[PDB]
């Protein structure tokens, strides 16, 4: 029996406030945990989007047994969309916010994706489940 | 808001060692593979994307897809029904002689296990009780 799902996705942002506002507003994500200058954790359906300041998640506290991590550079992750329409709605919401649409892509099977950057430069995508054969929610 | 997260990306220099790991240790189904470039696995309704950071960053060719690539140790977590499932994987890591970096009991009585994939990424397996997911 392999794992049934991915519960947490980690991204790193040196400016946590700019990242906290980006996801809170652009995507309306619920914020669950927040420790100033350290991290901001959002919930998305049954998954968690974890944003860490790479410098702190990297720091070794003697009483914190939690394994350390931290990456440098531009990350990537994709939000799920139910169809081209949801993808289109998101693309429009980005235009309405002055957020550049780095890319809009139609895949061989005819599915779509939209691409943007969060304040840290991470590649944030929105794609319909069709990209990987995930039947619509139902 | 988006109803879910579909893709999670990790980086690794040695893709074959990374593929072996996620395929044999976790039994994830491979969906896409481009030699020396990337390997994508399916996990439930999600996708774990493995990239060679150098190959994702490199200036195009005419790859319209945005560039990315991070160097360092990343992190992500697999979902587990309860403690029994967290424990099964813990036992499985030991059977595979993979060192268990950390076994943790959270304040609400939730459990997680931590190990490292070949690239150094912090790979976790925690129960949904952790964030209140029924
Ligand atoms: Co993509």
- Classify burial at A60, counting beta carbons within 10 Å of its beta carbon; exposed 0-12, middle 13-18, buried 19 or more: exposed
Instruction: Tell the residue number behind the tokens 């076994």, with chain if given.
Output: B103
Instruction: Tell me which chain A residue has its CA closest to the CA of residue B4.
Output: A45
For residue A1, being part of any structural domain is answered with no
Domain-embedded: residue A100: yes
Residue ranges making up the domain that contains A38: 7-138
In a domain, B65, yes or no: yes
- Whole-Å CA distances, A123 to A117, B67, B68, B70, B110: 5, 8, 7, 11, 32
Rounded Cα–Cα distance for residues A22 and A11 (Å): 13
Distance from residue B47's CA to the centre of ligand 1 (Å): 10
* Chain B interface test: which of A1, A31, A69, A128 (most B C-beta within 10 Å): A69
Q: What experimental approach yielded this model? A: X-ray
In a domain, A70, yes or no: yes
- Kindly list the distances between the CA atom of residue A132 and the CA atoms of A79, A84, A129, B76, in Å, as whole numbers in the listed order: 13, 14, 6, 20
Give the closest residue to A46 by CA, choosing from B92, B2, B25, B64: B2
Instruction: Give CA–CA dist A46/A135, Å, rounded.
Output: 17
The answer to whether residue A19 sits within a structural domain is yes
Burial class (CB in 10 A: 0-12, 13-18, 19+), B87: middle
Residue A23 located in a structural domain: yes
Distance CA A122, CA B109 (A): 34
Shortest Cα distance, chain B CAs vs residue A66, angstroms:
7
- B1 part of a folded domain: no
Chain A residues in contact with B76 by the CB 8 A cut-off are 6, 8-10
**How far is Cα B67 from Cα B49, in angstroms, rounded to an integer?**
14
How far apart CA B43 and CA B127 sit, in angstroms, is: 16
Whether residue B26 is contained in a domain is answered as yes
Torsion of CA B19, B20, B21, B27, to 10 degrees: 90
In angstroms, rounded to a whole number, what is the distance separating the alpha carbons of residues A11 and B52? 17
The DSSP bridge pattern shows strands B69-73 and B75-80 to be unpaired
CA-based nearest residue to B12, from B59, B54, B67, B68: B54
Going from the Cα of A37 to the center of ligand 1, the distance in angstroms, rounded, reads 30
8 Å CB contact of B46 and A6: yes
Which chain A residue has the Cα nearest residue B88?
A1
Which tokens belong to B87? 């424990």
Give the strand pairing for A112-117 and A103-106: antiparallel
Strand partners, B40: B32, B49
Cβ of B114 within 8 Å of Cβ of A67? The answer is yes
CATH number of the domain encompassing residue B73: 3.10.180.10
User: Does the distance separating the beta carbons of B6 and A127 come in below 8 Å?
Assistant: yes
Beta bridge partners of A30: A43
- Beta carbons of B64 and A105 less than 8 Å apart: yes
Residue A10 Cα distances to A52, A65, B34, B94, B110, angstroms:
7, 18, 24, 25, 20
Structure tokens at B16: 């074959």
Q: Which residue in A116, A40, A34, A29 sits closest to A76, CA to CA?
A: A116
- Nearest residue in B to A127, CA atom: B6
> What would the two tokens of residue B25 be?
């240790």
Q: Between the CA of residue B6 and those of A80, A123, B26, B43, B122, what are the distances in Å? A: 5, 14, 18, 10, 20
Of residues B103, B118, B54, B120, the one with CA closest to residue A58: B120
Chains A and B form CB pairs within 8 A to the count of: 185
Q: How wide is the angle at C-alpha B40 spanned by C-alphas B100 and B103, nearest 5°?
A: 15
Residue B73 Cα distances to A135, B21, B70, angstroms: 33, 16, 9
Domain count of the fold of chain B: 1
Residue contact A7–B70, C-beta within 8 A: no
Give the torsion sign (CA, A131, A136, B2, B5). negative
Q: How far apart are the first and last CA of chain A?
A: 24
3-state secondary structure A58-104: CCCCCCCCCCCCEEEEECEEEEEECCHHHHHHHHHHHHCCCCCCCEE
Query: Is B63 within 8 Å of B22 (Cβ atoms)?
Result: no
Name every chain B residue with its beta carbon within 8 A of the beta carbon of A54. 72
B67 close to B53: Cβ distance less than 8 angstroms:
no
Instruction: Kindly give, in sequence order, each residue whose CB lies less than 8 Å from that of residue A129, ignoring residues fewer than 6 positions away.
Output: A80, A81, A82, A135, A136, B6, B45
For chain A, helix (H) and strand (E) counts, in that order, are: 3, 9
> Rounded to 5 degrees, what angle do the CA atoms B57, B68, B42 make?
115
């Amino acid at each position: 029996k392999p794992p049934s799902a991915i519960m947490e996705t980690a991204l790193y942002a040196d400016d946590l406030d700019a990242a906290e506002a980006f996801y809170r507003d652009v995507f309306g994500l619920e914020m669950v945990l927040k420790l100033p200058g350290q991290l901001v954790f959002f919930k998305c359906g049954r998954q968690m989007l974890l944003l860490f300041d790479p410098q702190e998640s990297s720091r070794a506290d003697a009483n914190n047994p939690i394994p350390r991590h931290g990456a440098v550079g531009q990350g990537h992750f994709c939000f799920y969309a139910d169809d081209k329409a949801e993808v289109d709605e998101w693309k429009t919401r980005f235009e309405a916010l002055e957020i550049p649409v780095e890319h809009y892509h139609r895949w061989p099977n005819g599915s779509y994706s939209v691409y943007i950057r969060d304040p840290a430069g991470n590649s944030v995508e929105v794609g319909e489940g069709k990209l990987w054969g995930f039947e619509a929610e139902n």
